[PDB]
Ligand binder design. Structure first.
Ligand code: ADP
Ligand code: ADP
Ligand code: ADP
Ligand code: MG
Ligand code: MG
Ligand code: MG
Lengths: 49, 446, 439, 50, 426, 66
C-alpha cells in the first residue's frame, strides 16, 4: 500500500533498544506433537485379548 | 492424500488392462511389455481369487526394463484392503533377529484377517446432564438427555459411566456416540442446533455436525489386522508398543501355532475372513543360501502369500556359496517358481515413456527436444534421459522461458556426464584417480 | 473357498492292515517301498518304547520326501507332537545354536496330565465378622456367603483371606463369581443378567446365571510339552513387586537353560508318572535340508541322540556326495558326516515316471476343482516329463484363470500353449540368459 | 561482515513473520469458509421449513 | 579467529545468469562443476523432485568436498543439510540399512507453528486435591493440576512464597526462586530472591520452531520425557536404539500430511552428502538403490576419488569410482578437473590472506613451484610453519629463507617414500 | 540406579580414564599422609603365542606407563 517513515522509525527502534520490541530470547521447550498412535491400536488390542 | 513430492514410478496407476486381461498399448501409465503385463494381470487375478497359496513368481530381465515398474503397477491395481509388503533383499541381515525370523515376519505381514463384530450404538445430540452426590437411597442419581433428529429421551446412569463423562470435560449441545457394552464415549464435535451458537468458536469442533437419525442402532465393526500383528500382540504384555519400536525379538513358535489354530477356528466359525495379500522382494540376489533354503519350506505352508521376486543378473555366484548359478538363485528354488521375462525397449516406447515423464513433471518439451532426448535415451539409457529432462527445466527457467528447447538439452548434456563418457575419461587419465592398488600421481609437473 | 498349498491332497500313507501299500490310496501314487518303511517307522513311534532313533530320507528334488514326512505326521494324529524345522532355522542370534537345538529337541516329547478340582458358582448375600482377646487389633473370624446358581442355592462359611481376595476383586452383592477352593481364588464372572435394566446404561456385561449345581466337582486333562515346563520354571510369571513386573515388561530373550533345571523337571515328571496322574508321549522332530547344518551341530547331534528321552528325528536331504558345510575337505554322502549316517537309518526315494506324473496332475486338478481334457492332460504330462513335475502343477492354475476369462470351464490345448508361452521355466530362462549382452 | 549477514538474512527474521501471517490468513480463510457454509445450511433449512 | 582447511569458501560465486565468474566467493577455476552445482541448487530450491542423485568424481585435491560445502552454504541455514562419510553406516546396535534410513529421515525438515500457554508467579497456597493459588504482580488466579505435575512440584520442594513458572503444553515445572517480598528472614540466607513476574498470570505465545522428520519419528519411537519419576524410569528401562518399523514412519507421514494440509506447517526437503562412497559395500549400495525410488527421499550427493576399482564386498566386480553399475545408471556424474600453476598460486595467495599472513612475491612463486612439483595440499599446509619461523626471527613477512627452512624441517610424501625405500631397518 | 543395576545383569563396561585418574590422585594424596603404602605386584602370562598382534601393540604402549 505505502510505507516510508516506518522504515526510519523502526530502524531508530533497533538502534536504540536492540534485542527486543519483536522477540526476546525464549524459554526453550520441546514440541508437543499430540496425535499419538497408542489410542488407535488400543481398541484392536483390547478386542484381541 | 499421502503427501509426497515425486517418485520414479509416480505416473503408474495400477497396471493397464481390459476386462479380457488384454494389455492396451498405452493406458494408466505404462506402455509396451504386453506379455509381461498380461502375466502380471493373471497373477493379480490369481491373488484376488484367494484360493491358491504359496506361489512364487520371479520377474527377470535386463536392468531398467519395467520390473519394479510392473511390481508397482500390480500393487496399485490390487488396491487397498489387500496387504502388499515390498521389501529389499539387503534388509534381512540384522543384528537383532536371525534372517529366518525376519523372513517369517515378512511372510506374516503380507496376510491379513478381517474380524467382524456387531455392536449396538447410541448417537444423538445431548442437551443436559444432571449429576447428584452419594445418598443412602442411591449411590449416584444421574440423568442424561439425548435429542436426535426425531426423538428426545432420558437415560439413567448406573454409578460408573459418570466417571466416563467426568474423566474428560464433556458438555451438552453436541452429538456423541456411546457403546452399550464397550462404554466408551466419543465426542464427535459440536451439534448444529442454532448456527449462531457455534459460529463464533474459532473453527474447531471438526466443522460441527447435525443429528442424522434415531437414538440407538446396530452396526458392524470390521478390524483388519495382519497375522504378525497378532503374534506381536500376544507375545508380550504390551506388544503393540513393539509394533512401532520394532523390538519383537524372535517370537516363540508356540505363539504362532496357537495363532494358527485360533484363526482357523474363527474361519470355520464364521467370525473372521482371510485376505492373502502379496509379498514382493526386490534384488533377491542379495539374499543368502540359508534364506533360500528356508523359503523353500516356508512357501508350502497353508498361510503362505503370493511371492514376487525381482532380480537383474544372470549366471552369477550365489551369496554364501562358491558356485555360479543362473539368476543368482539355487536350482531347487528356481524349480519351485515361475519365471516372467522382460525384453528391451523400442525407440518409440522410449519416446512415449519420456513424454509421460514430461507431462508428469509439468515440463513442456518441443518436438525437436523430445526427439533429441529419445535419441540420447536410445544411445545411452532411459534413466539418463529421464533425469536430463528434469535437469533442463532449471536451465530453461534461467533463460526466463518456460518451454524447453534444443539448446537447454544440449547444455544439460554437456554439463552432466554419463557412465560411458566418465569411463572413457577415467581410462584416458587413470594416473590421476586412485588406482586399484592405491597408486596415485598428484603433482602436475614431470 | 478352501485354500491349498502344494499339499492337502495327501491324507495318509494308504496302507492296509497288513502294512501293504496300495498303489493309489491316501493321495499317494507309487513309492511303495518308502511308504511301507514310513509306516513301519510310525508303528515303531506308536510302540512308545524306543528313544533316539534317527531316519533320513534320500532322493532328488521333487520326489516326495516332504510329502512322506507330512503323511507320517498326519498318520500319527493330532495328540502326538510333531515339530518341523528347517536346517537354517537353528542359527539363532539371541542364544547359541546348541541351546536352540536342545530346546527344539525337548519340544518334541509331550506330557498329558490330569487334575480334579472343585468349584463354586448368583451371589445372594455375604456377611463379614469376634472378640480380639489377644493381639488382634481388628478381627474378622469368618465370612458367610450364599450362592444361588441354577439347580438350587446354598450358603457356606469361608476364611478371612478369601474375603480379602473378594475385596480385592471388589464384587457387589448381586453378582456371579468364580471361586476355586483349590487355590482359594475368587474370580468375578460379572453382574447377573436378571439384574438388568436397573439403570438405563451399564458398561459391564451382565452375563447369564451359571447352569447346574453350585458345588461342581470336575476333572481336567491338559497336554503340554517338557519345553513348556522348562520355560515356566526358567521365566516365572508370578510376582507383585516392582522388580518382577518390570522384568516381565522387558522383551523375553532366550537364555542358556541349565542342565540342573532339566534334571529336576525330569525327576518331578517321573514322580508324577509313578502316581498315575500323568503319562508321557514321545513325538517327532523333523528337519529339512540337513545339509544346511554345520559340523558343530552335526557333532552335537551325536551326543543329543544318545540321551535318555530323545525323540524320533526324521531328516531330509537331497544332496549327493558333497562337502559338509563348516569344513572344506570332507566329502560325505548327502552332506552328513560319516558318524551321523552311521548312527541312523536310510530310506531311499525313487524318481517318478510318465504315468505317475499324469496321475499326480489329474489328482491335483481334481483337488483344485478344475476341468481338463484328456488331450490337454496328455500334453501337460509330456510337458512335465520334458521340464519338471513341479512345472505342470504350478502352471495348472494360470491355465484355469485363462479358461475362466474366456467363459470356458475346461482346460484345453490352446490354453496350455498360451500358458507355456506366457510363463517360462528354468531351462528356457537359462538358455536365454547367456545368449544376451546385458544380464 | 557481508557473507554472514547475507546467510542470516537468507534465514531472515521477517521470513518468520511472513510465515506466521500466511498461517494466520490460512486459518482465517478456513474460519470464513466454515461460517459461510454454516450460514448457507441455516438459510436452506429455513427456506425448506417455510 | 580460527580457520581449518575451509571458511575461505563462501559460495559458488554465481551471477543471476548462472555463469560462473573466474574468481568469486573464494573460488578459482572449476567453472563447469560450479555451474552444475548451481543448477542442482536451483533444482533443490524448486522443492518438487524427490530422490535425485548426483555424484561428483575427480582426483584428490580438486574441490569435491569444497563444492559440497559451498552448495550447503549457498542453500542457507533454513534448509537441512546432513553430511556423512561412508564409514558411519557401520554401527553396532542397529543394521546398516536402518542407519541409512535414519539419515534419510534426518535429511528433510518441517517448519511448524505452535501456541504455548504459560503460567508464572508467586504461590499463595498449596492444598492437596492439586489446587494452586498463583498470584502475579497484577493478577491472581487459582488452578487445578494433575497428580503428575503435583509430583513434579513436590520434587521441586516448592513452598509458599516461591515464584514458579509452569508450562501448560508440556507440564514442565521450574521453581524460579523465593519471592523478593520475604527478603529479610535470615542474615545469611542461602536462597536467592526474585521479583514477582510482570503481567497477568496466564500468557499465550506463538512460535515457529522448526523440526525434522526423524526428530518427531524418534519422539514417539523412544521418549525423553522429563521431570516425572515414572517417565524417568521408563526412559531408563531401554538405553539402546533400535530399528524403527515402517508402520511408525507411515503414521508419521500421515500426521505430517494432515498438519501441512491444515495450513499450519510447511515442508522443506534437504540434502544428504556422503563423502568417500567407495567405503560402502554391495548390500548398502543395493539398499540405497531401492530406497532412492521412494516418494519422500531427499537429494543425495556423493563424493569419490577412484578409478576402475573393485566394489567392496565383492570379489571380481569392477566398476568406475567403485560404484555398482546399477546405481551408476540412476546417477548424474559431475566431472572435476585438476589445476594449473597460476590457479595454484592464486589459491595459495587466498589461503595466505585469510590467515592474516604477509608473503612476498618471490616466496609466493617458490611456494607455487613447490606446489606444482609436490602437491597443492602440502604447499597450503606449509604456510603456518613458515609464519612461525618468520615470527621467531622477529619478522612479519615470509622470506625465501623461511620456505627453505620449512622444506628442510618437514617432508612431503615423495621424499618420505624415497627415504623409506633406501633404508635397511624398517 | 540400584533397581536398574539389579534388573540389567551388569556385564563389564570399559571403565573411563577419568575415574582411574581420580583414584590415582586420591591414592597419592593418602600415601602422602603416611597412612597407605604402594606395593607393585607381578603379572604372569603364559602361552603368549596365543596373543593377537593388536594385544601386543597395546602392550607396547601399556608397558611405558608409570
Ligand atoms: N512400461 C513402462 N512404463 C512406464 N515407465 C517405465 C516402464 N518401464 C520402465 N519404466 C521406467 O523405468 C524406471 C524403473 O526401472 P526398473 O525397470 O525398475 O529398473 P530395474 O528393472 O533395474 O529395477 C521407472 O522410472 C519407470 O518410469
Ligand atoms: N507319490 C506321490 N503321490 C502324490 N503326490 C506326490 C508323490 N510324490 C510327490 N508328490 C508331490 O510332489 C510335490 C513336491 O514334492 P516334494 O515332496 O516337495 O519334493 P522334495 O522331496 O524334494 O521336497 C508335493 O506337493 C507332493 O504332493
Ligand atoms: N577452486 C578452489 N578455490 C580454492 N580452494 C580450493 C579450490 N578447489 C579446491 N580447493 C582446496 O583444495 C582442498 C581439497 O579440497 P576437498 O574437496 O576438501 O578435497 P578433494 O578436493 O581432494 O576432494 C581444500 O582444502 C580446498 O580448500
Ligand atoms: Mg528395481
Ligand atoms: Mg522338501
Ligand atoms: Mg576431498
Amino acid at each position: 500500500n505505502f510505507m516510508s517513515i516506518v522504515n526510519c522509525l523502526m530502524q531508530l527502534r533497533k538502534v536504540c533498544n536492540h534485542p527486543n520490541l519483536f522477540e526476546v530470547r525464549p524459554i526453550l521447550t520441546s514440541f508437543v506433537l499430540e496425535h499419538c498412535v497408542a489410542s488407535d491400536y488400543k481398541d484392536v488390542e483390547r478386542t484381541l485379548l | 492424500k499421502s503427501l509426497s513430492l515425486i517418485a520414479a514410478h509416480s505416473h503408474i496407476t495400477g497396471l493397464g488392462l481390459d476386462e479380457n486381461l488384454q494389455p492396451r498399448p498405452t493406458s494408466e501409465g505404462m506402455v509396451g511389455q504386453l506379455q509381461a503385463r498380461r502375466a502380471a494381470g493373471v497373477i493379480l487375478k490369481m491373488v484376488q481369487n484367494g484360493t491358491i497359496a504359496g506361489r512364487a513368481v520371479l520377474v527377470a530381465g535386463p536392468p531398467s526394463t519395467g520390473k519394479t515398474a510392473l511390481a508397482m503397477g500390480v500393487s496399485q491395481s490390487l488396491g487397498k484392503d489387500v496387504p502388499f509388503t515390498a521389501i529389499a533383499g539387503s534388509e534381512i541381515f540384522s543384528l537383532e533377529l536371525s534372517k529366518t525370523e525376519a523372513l517369517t515376519q515378512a511372510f506374516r505381514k503380507s496376510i491379513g484377517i478381517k474380524i467382524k463384530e456387531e455392536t449396538e450404538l447410541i448417537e444423538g445430540e445431548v442437551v443436559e446432564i444432571q449429576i447428584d452426590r452419594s445418598i443412602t437411597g442411591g449411590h449416584k442419581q444421574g440423568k442424561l438427555t439425548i435429542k436426535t433428529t426425531d426423538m428426545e429421551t432420558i437415560y439413567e446412569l448406573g454409578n460408573k459411566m459418570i466417571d466416563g463423562l467426568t474423566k474428560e470435560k464433556v458438555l451438552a449441545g453436541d452429538v456423541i456416540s456411546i457403546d452399550k457394552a464397550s462404554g466408551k464415549i466419543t465426542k464427535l464435535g459440536r451439534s448444529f442446533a442454532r448456527s449462531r451458537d457455534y459460529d463464533a468458536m474459532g473453527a474447531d469442533t471438526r466443522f460441527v455436525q447435525c443429528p442424522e437419525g434415531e437414538l440407538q442402532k446396530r452396526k458392524t465393526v470390521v478390524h483388519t489386522v495382519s497375522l504378525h500383528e497378532i503374534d506381536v500382540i500376544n507375545s508380550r504384555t504390551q506388544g503393540f508398543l513393539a509394533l512401532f519400536t520394532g523390538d519383537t525379538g524372535e517370537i516363540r513358535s508356540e505363539v504362532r501355532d496357537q495363532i494358527n489354530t485360533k484363526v482357523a477356528e474363527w474361519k470355520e466359525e464364521g467370525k473372521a475372513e482371510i485376505v492373502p495379500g502379496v509379498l514382493f522382494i526386490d534384488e533377491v540376489h542379495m539374499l543368502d543360501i540359508e534364506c533360500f533354503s528356508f523359503i523353500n519350506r516356508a512357501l508350502e505352508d497353508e498361510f503362505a502369500p503370493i511371492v514376487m521376486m525381482a532380480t537383474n543378473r544372470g549366471v552369477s555366484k550365489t551369496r554364501g556359496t562358491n558356485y555360479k548359478s543362473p539368476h543368482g538363485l539355487p536350482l531347487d528354488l528356481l524349480d519351485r517358481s515361475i519365471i516372467i521375462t522382460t525384453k528391451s525397449y523400442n525407440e518409440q516406447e522410449i519416446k512415449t515413456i519420456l513424454s509421460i515423464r514430461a507431462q508428469e513433471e509439468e515440463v513442456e518439451l518441443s518436438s525437436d527436444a523430445l526427439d533429441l532426448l529419445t535419441k540420447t535415451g536410445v544411445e545411452t539409457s532411459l534413466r539418463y534421459s529421464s533425469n536430463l529432462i528434469s535437469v533442463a527445466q532449471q536451465i530453461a527457467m534461467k533463460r526466463k522461458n518456460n518451454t524447453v528447447e534444443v539448446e537447454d538439452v544440449k547444455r544439460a548434456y554437456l554439463l552432466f556426464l554419463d557412465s560411458a563418457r566418465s569411463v572413457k575419461y577415467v581410462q584416458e587419465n587413470e594416473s590421476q584417480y586412485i588406482d586399484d592398488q592405491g597408486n596415485v600421481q598428484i603433482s602436475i609437473a614431470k | 473357498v478352501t485354500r491349498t498349498a502344494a499339499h492337502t491332497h495327501i491324507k495318509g500313507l494308504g496302507l492296509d492292515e497288513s502294512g501293504v501299500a496300495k498303489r493309489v490310496e491316501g493321495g499317494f501314487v507309487g513309492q511303495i517301498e518308502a511308504r511301507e518303511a514310513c509306516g513301519v517307522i510310525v508303528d515303531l513311534i506308536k510302540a512308545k518304547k524306543m528313544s533316539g532313533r534317527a531316519i533320513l530320507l534320500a532322493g532328488g528334488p521333487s520326489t516326495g520326501k516332504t510329502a512322506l514326512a507330512l503323511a507320517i505326521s498326519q498318520e500319527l494324529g493330532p495328540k502326538v507332537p510333531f515339530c518341523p524345522l528347517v536346517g537354517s532355522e537353528l542359527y539363532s542370534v539371541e542364544v547359541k545354536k546348541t541351546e536352540t537345538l536342545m530346546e527344539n529337541f525337548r519340544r518334541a516329547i509331550g506330557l498329558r496330565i490330569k487334575e480334579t478340582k472343585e468349584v463354586y458358582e448368583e451371589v445372594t448375600e455375604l456377611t463379614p465378622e469376634e472378640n480380639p482377646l489377644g493381639g488382634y487389633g481388628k478381627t474378622i473370624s469368618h465370612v458367610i456367603v450364599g450362592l444361588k446358581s441354577a439347580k438350587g442355592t446354598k450358603t457356606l462359611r469361608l476364611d478371612p483371606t478369601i474375603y480379602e481376595s473378594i475385596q480385592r476383586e471388589k464384587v457387589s452383592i448381586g453378582d456371579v463369581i468364580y471361586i476355586e477352593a483349590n487355590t482359594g481364588a475368587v474370580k468375578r464372572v460379572g453382574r447377573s443378567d436378571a439384574y438388568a435394566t436397573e439403570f438405563d446404561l451399564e458398561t459391564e456385561e451382565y452375563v447369564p446365571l451359571p447352569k447346574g449345581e453350585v458345588h461342581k466337582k470336575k476333572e481336567i486333562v491338559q497336554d503340554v510339552t517338557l519345553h513348556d515346563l522348562d520355560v515356566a520354571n526358567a521365566r516365572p510369571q508370578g510376582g507383585q513387586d516392582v522388580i518382577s513386573m518390570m522384568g516381565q515388561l522387558l522383551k523375553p530373550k532366550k537364555t542358556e537353560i541349565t542342565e540342573k533345571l532339566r534334571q529336576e523337571v525330569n525327576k518331578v515328571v517321573a514322580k508324577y508318572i509313578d502316581q498315575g496322574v500323568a503319562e508321557l508321549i514321545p513325538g517327532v522332530l523333523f528337519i529339512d535340508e540337513v545339509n544346511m547344518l554345520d559340523i558343530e551341530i552335526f557333532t552335537y547331534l551325536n551326543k543329543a541322540l544318545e540321551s535318555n528321552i530323545a525323540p524320533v528325528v526324521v531328516l531330509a536331504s537331497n544332496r549327493g556326495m558333497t562337502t559338509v558345510r563348516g569344513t572344506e575337505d570332507v566329502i560325505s554322502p548327502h552332506g552328513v558326516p560319516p558318524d551321523l549316517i552311521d548312527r541312523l537309518l536310510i530310506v531311499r526315494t525313487l524318481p517318478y515316471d510318465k504315468d505317475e506324473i499324469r496321475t499326480i496332475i489329474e489328482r491335483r486338478a481334481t483337488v483344485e476343482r478344475l476341468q481338463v481334457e484328456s488331450s490337454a492332460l496328455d500334453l501337460l504330462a509330456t510337458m512335465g516329463t520334458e521340464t519338471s513335475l513341479r512345472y505342470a502343477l504350478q502352471l495348472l492354475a494360470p491355465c484355469g484363470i485363462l479358461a475362466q476369462t474366456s467363459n470356458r470351464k475346461e482346460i484345453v490345448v490352446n490354453d496350455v500353449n498360451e500358458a507355456k508361452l506366457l510363463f517360462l521355466d528354468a531351462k528356457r530362462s537359462t538358455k536365454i540368459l547367456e545368449t544376451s549382452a546385458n544380464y | 561482515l557481508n557473507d554472514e549477514l547475507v546467510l542470516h538474512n537468507k534465514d531472515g527474521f521477517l521470513a518468520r513473520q511472513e510465515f506466521l501471517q500466511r498461517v494466520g490468513s490460512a486459518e482465517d480463510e478456513r474460519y470464513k469458509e466454515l461460517r459461510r457454509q454454516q450460514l448457507a445450511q441455516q438459510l436452506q433449512q429455513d427456506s425448506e421449513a417455510s
